[PDB]
């Protein structure tokens, strides 16, 4: 019953509160777990543990939609489980189409499984690296960067960057919850030579800014982002000014949904962050909406920066389909 | 084997019976029962009269989706003769990859109905150009979801198929308004979304519509109105229109300048949905490259 | 005193007697006529009668420039009694100006030809939106003036009014092509340049015209291409509308969903030819600004 407490402990930790910050670990937890749950259940066909996979993957995702990698890395796993069946066993396409199976047995998949998780966990622990590395073929000497605010992924692309040059940052605070602060003083204590502004300067500043550089919570399947408050005023502005917009994101942000699905997108907390509860009588009459989460449209996004390389917001379809089988959307 | 009579009377007498049903669906189904009756043995030859009845299959109903289908057709014969290189065992298997093809076809309707009514929500104004089977399915299925919702419909004066599906839709119990072809412009900053049919997919992810089209996704991208695009995958052809005059004549003209057909570039394109599932423009290019290689 | 009946018919035979003058300058006239028979005594009445009289026309026709020129009468009334106390020097006074009124009013359409006819050149391709009396003044000016060049028309589906137009310049022997309403975009790119009309200029400098203007407007931003307006003074009036909802109703209709009007904003017009000249449309508002202190 360890599993089954270890399952209902993150279900918990997910409902009430982050218990792992960063998106990094939350994908290993599920990875963890997942494969906890593939050796400790036991299942004799594939088909039986891709449907038990689905019920966990359900939950889980039920728990908290906002939070999209438990839901990725399920889809990841069950994908990895669809190929290695089909290695062992014996891509919609025109080609498909012009040219032209479950609930069979195999003693060997389990083991295959596990090693597929286990390289995937691996190829998950140096994806802040590549990034990094990656990041001095995009930042030129005496540039000016904008960032909205705070991202693990980008503070070290910045640091990367600034070990061989020399350029200014301007951090732009994400309110309510003013990260950016933090991000600004960890890239000063580099001497990176930042500056720290409020969201209400961002188009007052964006036509001095040489490109824009930021994170996201989720890639969706046109090359949407969902990304935090204020990303989609900074993408506008960028627009508008025409500076390139780069998104530095790893593949495991990368969810097969769709915007327009039962407008479960924003996440909504207390009101008490924009309006304290010691303003008194008006907030009985007063709707105050404090969402955290922002849609951005996939037109407005110039570069896709990850662990594989840089991308088109256009190729994102064909990431989709190397990662995500076409019947694992619904889960 | 057929003689250019049995051909074009086949075609019209399966457009007749069965009115709910695609033009280029019609033109693959006849090609298919030309195969079956064919008394020949040789690819070469096989080929050449596939190719050749498909200029007398566009002389009537030259749309885009019938050279389509003609062009898909011959690439499905020349994927089948590579595999196999006995025209007489390739023969049963070319006859049985046709049925299943045309099976998986009749269903495009379905697939992309249940892939884009998700798309529509409740109070939403949708804004539609002329009669399409694939809108009114897709409608058909939002209705089926209960959602409410409202739709405009241009009245496509050449032919005036506006008012059949503004008919078709009120059938529905749809609240439903038709509006003239000049009116796009006043009408775009009341719809929240615009669907419309294609024609033909070309190369780079635009589409090949009617006439009216062209406007509508450039007052919508104007207004910043999502214009999104339902188009089966028979559709895709290999045409790249630089400008409106680039267009094949063939297309255009016989159903003082009235032209039946225009092209709209993939940037003013959202999303198409296909049976295929939901792409970016960017994506039909891919799959009408991994036809050819 | 003039009854409403001898309003109303005056009005029509004003406009029956000679077909090639505008409703606004006809609606002008009927004001002066009635003014010149009115046997009042006070300014206050005069301005009350005159205003019903301007709410019965306006009855009559629902036309923009019908409610612009009385609004400029109105205007023009004030603009005499501001200088005159006594109402007998007063009403001669205004008897003389709108006389002089009257015929800059009626020489206003040569002097817009003249003015805009330079802009067309050589083997220029002109796109005109319906019938307007301004434009084909201004291509008879061109014509006059030994140019060469093609002119594409449309049809303006709710009353073909673009036959009429290509009639018209056909007469004129000018090589014309009627294209329907949902072509603009399809026609846009072989186009040079785009001169239209308008029933009304609105404060910010856009206007006011048939269904189908801010369309096409919208197709020569995006590809481009130069967009001329054409009208004459006394269709200046004060409306600011935010979008084509905000545009009034007297307007739209009486002229499922069919209205007669749209809105075209400052922004897609290049200039404004009228008888104070070419203008940007900033202009307009400054005129207007200048008007009413």
Known sequence: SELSERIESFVETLKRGGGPRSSEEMARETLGLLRQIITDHRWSNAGELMELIRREGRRMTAAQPSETTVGNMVRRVLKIIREEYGRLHGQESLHKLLTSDFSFHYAQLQSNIIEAINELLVELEGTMENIAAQALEHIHSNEVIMTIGFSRTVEAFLKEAARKRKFHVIVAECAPFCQGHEMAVNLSKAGIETTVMTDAAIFAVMSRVNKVIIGTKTILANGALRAVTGTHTLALAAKHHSTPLIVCAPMFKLSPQFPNEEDSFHKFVAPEEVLPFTEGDILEKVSVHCPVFDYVPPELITLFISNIGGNAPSYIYRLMSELYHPDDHVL | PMDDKELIEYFKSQMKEDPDMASAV????????????????????????????????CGVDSSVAVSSGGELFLRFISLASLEYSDYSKCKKIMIERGELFLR?????????????????????????????????????????????????????????????????????????????????????????????????????????????????????????????????????????????????????????????????????????????????????????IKLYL
């Open chain 2, 104 to 288: 998986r076809i009749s269903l495009s309707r379905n697939k992309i109905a249940d892939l884009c009514h998700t798309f529509i929500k409740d109070g939403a104004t949708i804004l539609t150009h002329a009669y399409s089977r694939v809108v009114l399915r897709v409608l058909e299925a939002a209705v089926a979801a209960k959602k409410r919702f409202s739709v405009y419909v241009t009245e496509s004066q050449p032919d005036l198929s506006g008012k059949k599906m503004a008919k078709a839709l009120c059938h529905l119990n749809v609240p439903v308004t038709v509006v003239l072809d000049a009116a796009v412009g006043y009408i775009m900053e009341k719809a929240d979304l615009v669907i419309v049919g294609a024609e033909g997919v070309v190369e780079n992810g635009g589409i090949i519509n009617k006439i009216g089209t062209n406007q509508m996704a450039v007052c919508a991208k104007a207004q910043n109105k999502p214009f999104y695009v339902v188009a089966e995958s028979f559709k895709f052809v290999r045409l790249f229109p630089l400008n409106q005059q680039d267009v094949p004549d063939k297309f255009k003209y016989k159903a003082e300048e009235h032209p039946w057909v225009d092209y709209t570039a993939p940037s003013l394109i959202t999303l198409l949905f296909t049976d295929l599932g939901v792409l970016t423009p960017s994506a039909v290019s891919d799959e009408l």
């Open chain 2, 26 to 57: 019609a033109a693959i189904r006849t090609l298919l029962e030309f195969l079956k009756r064919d008394k020949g043995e040789t690819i070469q030859g096989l080929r050449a009269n596939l190719t050749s009845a498909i200029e007398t299959l």
